[PDB]
Ligand binder design. Sequence first.
Ligand SMILES: *[C@@H]1O[C@H](CO)[C@@H](O[C@@H]2O[C@H](CO)[C@@H](O)[C@H](O)[C@H]2NC(C)=O)[C@H](O)[C@H]1NC(C)=O
Ligand SMILES: *[C@@H]1O[C@H](CO)[C@@H](O[C@@H]2O[C@H](CO)[C@@H](O)[C@H](O)[C@H]2NC(C)=O)[C@H](O)[C@H]1NC(C)=O
Ligand SMILES: *[C@@H]1O[C@H](CO)[C@@H](O[C@@H]2O[C@H](CO)[C@@H](O)[C@H](O)[C@H]2NC(C)=O)[C@H](O)[C@H]1NC(C)=O
Ligand SMILES: *[C@@H]1O[C@H](CO)[C@@H](O[C@@H]2O[C@H](CO)[C@@H](O)[C@H](O)[C@H]2NC(C)=O)[C@H](O)[C@H]1NC(C)=O
Ligand SMILES: *[C@@H]1O[C@H](CO)[C@@H](O[C@@H]2O[C@H](CO)[C@@H](O)[C@H](O)[C@H]2NC(C)=O)[C@H](O)[C@H]1NC(C)=O
Ligand SMILES: *[C@@H]1O[C@H](CO[C@@H]2O[C@@H](C)[C@@H](O)[C@@H](O)[C@@H]2O)[C@@H](O)[C@H](O)[C@H]1NC(C)=O
Ligand SMILES: *[C@@H]1O[C@H](CO[C@@H]2O[C@@H](C)[C@@H](O)[C@@H](O)[C@@H]2O)[C@@H](O)[C@H](O)[C@H]1NC(C)=O
Ligand SMILES: *[C@@H]1O[C@H](CO)[C@@H](O)[C@H](O)[C@H]1NC(C)=O
Ligand SMILES: *[C@@H]1O[C@H](CO)[C@@H](O)[C@H](O)[C@H]1NC(C)=O
Ligand SMILES: *[C@@H]1O[C@H](CO)[C@@H](O)[C@H](O)[C@H]1NC(C)=O
Ligand SMILES: *[C@@H]1O[C@H](CO)[C@@H](O)[C@H](O)[C@H]1NC(C)=O
Ligand SMILES: *[C@@H]1O[C@H](CO)[C@@H](O)[C@H](O)[C@H]1NC(C)=O
Lengths: 729, 729
Amino acid sequence: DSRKTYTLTDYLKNTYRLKLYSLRWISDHEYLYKQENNILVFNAEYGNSSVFLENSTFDEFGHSINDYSISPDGQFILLEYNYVKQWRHSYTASYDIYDLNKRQLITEERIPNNTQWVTWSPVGHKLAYVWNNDIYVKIEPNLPSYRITWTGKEDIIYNGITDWVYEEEVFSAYSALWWSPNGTFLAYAQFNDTEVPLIEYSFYSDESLQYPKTVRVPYPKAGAVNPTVKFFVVNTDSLSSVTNATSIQITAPASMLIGDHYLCDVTWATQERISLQWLRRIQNYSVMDICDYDESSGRWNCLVARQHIEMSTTGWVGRFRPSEPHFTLDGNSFYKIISNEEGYRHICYFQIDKKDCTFITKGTWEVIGIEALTSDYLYYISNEYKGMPGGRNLYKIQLSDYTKVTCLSCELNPERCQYYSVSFSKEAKYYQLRCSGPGLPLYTLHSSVNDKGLRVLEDNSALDKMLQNVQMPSKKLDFIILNETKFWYQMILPPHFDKSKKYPLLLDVYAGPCSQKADTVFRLNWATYLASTENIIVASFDGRGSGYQGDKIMHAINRRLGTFEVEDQIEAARQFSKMGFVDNKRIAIWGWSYGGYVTSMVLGSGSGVFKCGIAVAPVSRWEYYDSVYTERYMGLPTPEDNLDHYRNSTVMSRAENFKQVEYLLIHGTADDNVHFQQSAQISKALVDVGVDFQAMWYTDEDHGIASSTAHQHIYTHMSHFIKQCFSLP
Amino acid sequence: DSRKTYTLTDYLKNTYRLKLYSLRWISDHEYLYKQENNILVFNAEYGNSSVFLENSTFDEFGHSINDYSISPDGQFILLEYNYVKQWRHSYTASYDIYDLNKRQLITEERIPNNTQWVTWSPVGHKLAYVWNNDIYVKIEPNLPSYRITWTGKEDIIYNGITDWVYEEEVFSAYSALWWSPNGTFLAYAQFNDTEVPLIEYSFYSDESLQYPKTVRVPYPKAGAVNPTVKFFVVNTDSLSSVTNATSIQITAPASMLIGDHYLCDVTWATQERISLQWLRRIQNYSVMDICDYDESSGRWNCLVARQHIEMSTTGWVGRFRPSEPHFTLDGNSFYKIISNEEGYRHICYFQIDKKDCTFITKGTWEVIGIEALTSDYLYYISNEYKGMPGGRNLYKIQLSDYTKVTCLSCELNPERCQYYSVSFSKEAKYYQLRCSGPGLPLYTLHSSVNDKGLRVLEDNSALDKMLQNVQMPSKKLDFIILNETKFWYQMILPPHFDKSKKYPLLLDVYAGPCSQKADTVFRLNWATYLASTENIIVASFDGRGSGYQGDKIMHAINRRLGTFEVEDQIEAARQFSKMGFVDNKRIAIWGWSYGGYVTSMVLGSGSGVFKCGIAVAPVSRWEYYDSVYTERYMGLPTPEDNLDHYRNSTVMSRAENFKQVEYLLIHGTADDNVHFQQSAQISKALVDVGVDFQAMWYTDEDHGIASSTAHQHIYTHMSHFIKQCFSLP
Ligand SMILES: *[C@@H]1O[C@H](CO)[C@@H](O[C@@H]2O[C@H](CO)[C@@H](O)[C@H](O)[C@H]2NC(C)=O)[C@H](O)[C@H]1NC(C)=O
Ligand SMILES: *[C@@H]1O[C@H](CO)[C@@H](O[C@@H]2O[C@H](CO)[C@@H](O)[C@H](O)[C@H]2NC(C)=O)[C@H](O)[C@H]1NC(C)=O
Ligand SMILES: *[C@@H]1O[C@H](CO)[C@@H](O[C@@H]2O[C@H](CO)[C@@H](O)[C@H](O)[C@H]2NC(C)=O)[C@H](O)[C@H]1NC(C)=O
Ligand SMILES: *[C@@H]1O[C@H](CO)[C@@H](O[C@@H]2O[C@H](CO)[C@@H](O)[C@H](O)[C@H]2NC(C)=O)[C@H](O)[C@H]1NC(C)=O
Ligand SMILES: *[C@@H]1O[C@H](CO)[C@@H](O[C@@H]2O[C@H](CO)[C@@H](O)[C@H](O)[C@H]2NC(C)=O)[C@H](O)[C@H]1NC(C)=O
Ligand SMILES: *[C@@H]1O[C@H](CO[C@@H]2O[C@@H](C)[C@@H](O)[C@@H](O)[C@@H]2O)[C@@H](O)[C@H](O)[C@H]1NC(C)=O
Ligand SMILES: *[C@@H]1O[C@H](CO[C@@H]2O[C@@H](C)[C@@H](O)[C@@H](O)[C@@H]2O)[C@@H](O)[C@H](O)[C@H]1NC(C)=O
Ligand SMILES: *[C@@H]1O[C@H](CO)[C@@H](O)[C@H](O)[C@H]1NC(C)=O
Ligand SMILES: *[C@@H]1O[C@H](CO)[C@@H](O)[C@H](O)[C@H]1NC(C)=O
Ligand SMILES: *[C@@H]1O[C@H](CO)[C@@H](O)[C@H](O)[C@H]1NC(C)=O
Ligand SMILES: *[C@@H]1O[C@H](CO)[C@@H](O)[C@H](O)[C@H]1NC(C)=O
Ligand SMILES: *[C@@H]1O[C@H](CO)[C@@H](O)[C@H](O)[C@H]1NC(C)=O
C-alpha cells in the first residue's frame, strides 16, 4: 500500500471537504438553495429550479452580506451584514430590507445598526427586533417602528433576548420572543440580572490597544443569585390603533413563585392559546400552563385543569430540560417526549385538560425527537433500529392506529446510512433526509404522500473518489458488558489494523450527562489523522451518565458528577487492554471542557493506567461553572444540600497524583463559558505540590478556540505532545 | 573528582547560604545588630557589646513580629506586624510601640491598622505615618496624633506616599515624607492620579473564591496622562489640637510648570534649607531649587540665583534619574555626581550661590556614589581600579587637594575582593566594608582617622568549608573589542574547564539601559547549577547601552531601545561561538523582563545563532510599559516625536522569524509591573503566523514569580527546557 495517509495538514487545511446540501423550505412545495453565490429556488416535486436572487444583485451594496432572510410571503428579503458574534448564539448586526417585487432596497425607517435580534412574523412580513435591550415592531418594512418596552438596560434588563445563562443553558438561543401562529400576538420574556454577579476577565485585542479591556458579564455561578424572569404577550394588531399597546403579563404558577425558578419553554398552540413551562431552581419539578386569550377582559388565563406537572424521582427533568410540546392543529391535545415508568423516553399523548397521558411508543430504546405532525401521522427520530443507541432513523406512526409504525429510513442504505436527521417542508408534504454515517454523508429528497425517494441531492461522490487514494482509518462500533449492563464504545482504528500487534491508544473523552461519544457518524477530524498517519487507536466510551439509553444509565451520576463517569472511562481503558491489541505502556487520554474535566480527574486518580493526557478548557471545580447546568445535576452547594460532593469533586484536590503522569493544560483567556479561572486554579494547585506539566494559553480565544490560526496552532501543539508521549526508544 | 556538584536542589533549597552582617548605626560610635533574635549594641572601637533587646521580651506578644525600628534616642521601638506586601517597596502593616523606659508597650493612641508608612524623626522620637492616604504626626508615642492632610483618597490622592509609578520609577520607595535634620519640619509630596488610566487584570486567589477579583491600579503607560505632583512643608513644633496644621507649599520652577514634570529628588541641606530637583517629562532637562525658611513670614523661598540646571544633549539626565546632592555641614555648598564633558560621571563641587561647579574627580571611569563627607574628606565608590568597569572600591579624596586620592579597599585583599559597598557611622568616624566578590563575601570594620582595619565581622569561613566539598564553577571576566571599543563579558565556567572540549553555551542577558551583567560579584544562582552540574557555560555581555562606562556607550541606545543592545548580544554570541571551547550548535539565550525583551528580539532577529531561548515576563512593546521609565529612553509615542521607533521595536513584528528556534515564554498573571498583556500579545502574534512554542503562566504571581512554590516550579521547568534543547541527538 503506497497510498498517502490522512495527515495533520489535511485536517487543518480541510483538503478533504464534506459537501453539504443546506436548503430552506419557503413553503410546502419549494425551497431555496445557494449555488454559485446566487439564491436558487427548487420545485421539490420535479427538481427543476429558477434563479430566485442573482448573485450580482448586491455587488454595489458596499458591505459583505453575512446572511439572508426571506419574509414568509416572499415579498421581502432581510439582508444581514456587519455581523459581530457574541456568545454561542448571540450576535449583533446591521440590516437592510429589500423589496423583491419592486426589486429595490428600502431606505426609510431602517432597522437600526447594532440590532441584537430580528425576526419576521410567521406569516406576512411584520418584523420584531431588539435594539438596546428593548423590543420594537414594524408592521410594514418601510413604516416607523412601534416601541414595545422602555426598561431595556445593558447587562441589566433584557427584553426579547436572553442573558448569558438563559442563552447557553435554557433556550440555546439569543431570542426571547415568540410570534403567535398568524402573527397577531407577540410574546416575550424579560430577564432582570440586577443582582447577578459578574465574571470579569481581560481582553487584549489587537496589539494597538494600549490598555487591556475588562470584559464583564452577568453570570451566575453555582449557588449564586440567578436572574429573575417575567413573561408578556402584546397584541401587534392593535399597535396602529393605540398609542401604547399594553403588554399583558402571564405570571408563573404559585408552585414556582414560592422560590427561584426558570421559564424553560414557550410554545403556541393556536392563535389564542399559548403554553408555557416553568422549572424550579431545583430542576426535578416543572409545571406547564396552557393559557387562552380572554377577548372580554383582554387578559390571558391559564386554567389549573389544563396545568400539567412533570417531575423526576431519579434525577432532573428532561435530557437537558423539559421537552417541548407538539400540538394538534386544533390545540386541544399535544405530544411530548417523556420518560416512562421504565426510564425510557417515549412519546406521550396529552389532552390539554386531562392530567394522565397515553404513551404511543415504548420499548428499550428512546425517541430522540418529534420532527413533524400531520392530521394522520407523527414523524419522529429514534435509536430503535437494531438496538443501536448510537444510530438514528426516521419513523412514521399512524395516529389512528399506533400499531402501525413504519421506519422511513432504516433500509434506504443500511450499510452506508445508520444516522439520520430530517427536514420537512411547511406542511410535511416533502422531507429531506440527511445521512451522516457510518459512510459518507448522503442527502436525499422524498415525498410524504407515498414515501418515495424523489432524488439524490448530494452523495459526496467527488470526496469518495479522493478518499480512495488515501489510507483511511476504519471505525469499530461495539459494546462491552459491565454488571450485566451493555456499554457502547467506538475505536478509530488505523489502516490495516492488525489484532496481533500492539498499538498505542488515545482515549477521546467527553462523558458529560446524557452525552454520546459512541455513534455511527462519519467524521474527518484529529482522530482521523492520529489513526491514519500515526497509527494510533482513538477510542471513546459511553459509561454511566451517558444518554439515549434510559434513565438508569443517564441518572446514574445524579448529584455525583466526577465519579461514575470518571471511573468508567478508566475501566474502559482496562477493558480495551484485555482485548490484546493495545500497548498498555502507551495509553493516553484527552478531552475538551467536560471532557477536560474527566481527563483531569482520571489523570489525577492514581490509576496508573494512563501515561499522559491533555485537558482543553476543562471545568475544575463545579462552583466555578454556571447555575442552570451545574445545579441540574449537582443541586445546591450548601451544607444542607450537596456542598460536600461539590468540594470533593474538584481537580485541584488530586494535584499530588499528577506526579505520575505527563499533563498538558490548554485554555483560551477569553473563555466566557468555562472561565480561564478554572485552569488558572488547576495550574496553581499543581505548582503548589511541585508537579511539572505543560501549559498553553490562547490569547483572546473563547471556549471554542476556533479562530483559524488558533485552531491550527492548538492541534499542532497537541500533536507534538501526543507523538512525544508515545515516542518509543 | 568524586565530590558532589552544585545541583538544582541546592539552589532551590538554599543549601549553601551566604552569611551577612547587617548592622544599623545609631551614632558615630555604636551600631545595632540582630543576633539570634536578640538585638545587641556594639561599640565600634573595641567590638564589645551589650543586649539592647531580649529575644524573649515579646514571647506573649501574640503576633509574629516582622521587623523592628528603634527610635533615634533608643527610648522606643516600633514593632511591625501583619505585614501585607503591595508593590516592590509598598506594603501595609500594624504597629505597636514599646517603651524601653517603662518596659511596656503603649496601649494609648496606638497607630492604626493598615498603616501605609511610618517613620521616626531623624532625632528624638516623634512619629509620622500615613493612613488611608493621609499624613499624621505624633510628638509623643502615647499621645494623640495630629492629622496633617484631609484630602487622602484611595487610588486618587496620595499624601506622604507614592503612587505606582513614582514608587517604582522615581523614588524606589513608598514613602514621600522627608523629616528635617532635627525633626522640626516634615516635608512631603502629594500625588494626584485622578486622570491616570488604570491597568486591570484578574486575581484568582484561593480556590474558595468563586468569582475572580479584578485588580485596578493607576498606571500611566507610555504617552498616557501622568499623575500631577505638589510639594509641602509643615512645622511639627507648632501643631495644635484645636486648629488644623498649616502646610506651606513650595511650587516648582516656571521652567517645569510650562508642562508635564516630575519631582525627582528631595534632600535637606540644613535645619532651614531644603533642596528639590524637578524633571521635565522629556527627561533631558532637570532643575534644582534651594529653598530657605523665612522665619519672618514663616514661608519657604527658593532664590532663582540658587537655581541649578542639569541637562543632557546625548540622552537623559542621570543613570535612572538626577543624582542626589550631598551638602556640607553649613549647607553653603554640595557635591553631586554628574556627567562631564567626556560623558563620564564624576563628582562636581557646587556653591549654592554659583552656577559653575568644579569637577573634583576625572578620568575614563565613573564614580558610582558619594558615601560620606567630612570637612576634610569626601568618600566615594568608583570602578577606577585597574580600569575594570565591573569592579568597585572605596576612595577618599582630600577636599583641600584633589590630587590626593587614596583607595581604601583596593589592596585589602585583591584576589578575593574587587567589589565593595560601604556603610559609614553617623559622622564617618567608622565604616563597615562589604566585599561581595569575586571570592566569598567578607565584612570588615574600619576607623577613618588612620583607616585602620579594626576587625573582621563575618568572613563566611563556614560556607567556604562547605563549598570545598563541591565541584564549584569558576568565573572568567574579560572583554572583546567592537569597533575600537572595549566591551566586557563574563562566563560561568564548569568545574575542570577544558578548553580542548566543546561546551554548550547559555547567554544570560538583561541588557537594559545602564545595566551591568559582567562584574566581579560572587553569586550562587541558577547559572551556578547549570555550569557545575550540567557543564553549561553561562555567559553575559555588556554592550551598547550598558552603564558605568561613560555616556558614549550608555546613551548609544537613546530613543533607540531594541536595536544596538540587541545587536550587540548577537555579535557577542557570534564571537563566543568562534572560540574553540564553545559548541556553536548548542547556544541558547534567556533573560527576565528587559532581559526577556532582548531575548525575544534576539530570537526573532533571524541571526540563526541561537537554537533556543527563554523569555520570562518580557516587555514586548514599549507603549505597554510605564511612562517614566519608557519615555526616559524613548521620548513620546507621537508622530512628531518617536512613534515610528516605538512601532518598529516590538517583539510581535518579528514573530515569523521564530520559525527556526525553540522558544519558552513564561509570565505571572498578576504582574503589575510588566503586564501579562505583553506576553499575551507575543503568543497571539506567534499563533497568527503558525509558529509553535512553549509557554507557562503562573497564576497570581507578579513580576518576581518569587513565591516559594512558583520559584521552584519555574526554575525546574526552565531546567528541563534547557537540558532538552542541549540534548545530544
Ligand atoms: C430588576 O430587579 C431589581 C431588584 O433587584 C429592581 O430594583 C428594585 O426596584 C424597586 C422599585 O423601584 C426599588 O424600590 C428597589 O430599591 C430596587 N432594588 C434594587 C436592587 O435596585 C428593578 O426594579 C427590576 N427592574 C425591572 C425593570 O423589573
Ligand atoms: C408605554 O407604557 C409603559 C408601561 O406603562 C410605560 O412605561 C412606564 O413609564 C413610566 C414613566 O416613564 C415608569 O414610571 C414606569 O415604570 C414604566 N413602566 C414600564 C413597565 O416600563 C411607557 O413609558 C409607555 N410609553 C409611552 C410612549 O407612553
Ligand atoms: C389571527 O388570529 C387572531 C386571533 O384569533 C385574529 O383576531 C381575531 O379575529 C376575530 C375574527 O376572526 C375577531 O373577532 C377578534 O376580535 C380578533 N381578536 C384579536 C386577537 O385581535 C386575527 O384575525 C387572525 N388573523 C387573520 C386575519 O387571519
Ligand atoms: C486632582 O486633580 C484633579 C484634576 O485632574 C482636580 O479636579 C479638577 O478640579 C477642578 C476644580 O475643582 C475642576 O474644574 C475639574 O473639572 C477637576 N478635574 C476633573 C476631575 O475633571 C482635583 O481637584 C485634584 N485634587 C486635589 C485634592 O488636588
Ligand atoms: C531644629 O531647628 C529649628 C530651626 O533652626 C529650631 O527652631 C528654631 O529655634 C530658634 C531659636 O534658636 C527660633 O528662633 C526659631 O523660631 C525656631 N524655628 C522655627 C521652629 O520656626 C529648633 O529648636 C531645632 N531643634 C532643636 C532643639 O535641636
Ligand atoms: C418547475 O417546473 C414547473 C413545470 O413543470 C412541468 O410541468 C409539470 C406538470 C410536469 O409535467 C413537469 O415534468 C414539467 O417539467 C413550473 O410550473 C414551475 O414554476 C417550475 N418551478 C421552478 C421554481 O422553476
Ligand atoms: C563597651 O565597653 C565600654 C568599656 O570598655 C572598657 O573601657 C574602654 C575605654 C577600653 O579600655 C576597653 O578596652 C574596656 O573594655 C563600655 O563603656 C561600653 O558601654 C561598652 N559598649 C557596649 C554597648 O557594650
Ligand atoms: C449605520 O451606521 C453607518 C455607519 O457605519 C451609517 O452610515 C448608517 O447610516 C447607519 N444606518 C442606520 C441603521 O442608521
Ligand atoms: C427534588 O430534589 C430535592 C433535592 O434533592 C429533593 O429533596 C426532592 O425530594 C426532589 N423532588 C422530587 C421531584 O422527587
Ligand atoms: C487593629 O485590628 C484589631 C483586630 O480587629 C483590633 O483588635 C485592634 O484594636 C486594632 N488596632 C487599632 C489601632 O485600632
Ligand atoms: C480641619 O479640616 C477638616 C477638613 O476640611 C475639617 O473637617 C475639620 O473640621 C477641620 N478642623 C477644624 C475644626 O478646624
Ligand atoms: C531634549 O530631548 C528632545 C527630544 O529629542 C530634544 O528635542 C531637545 O533638543 C533636547 N534638549 C536638550 C536638553 O538637549
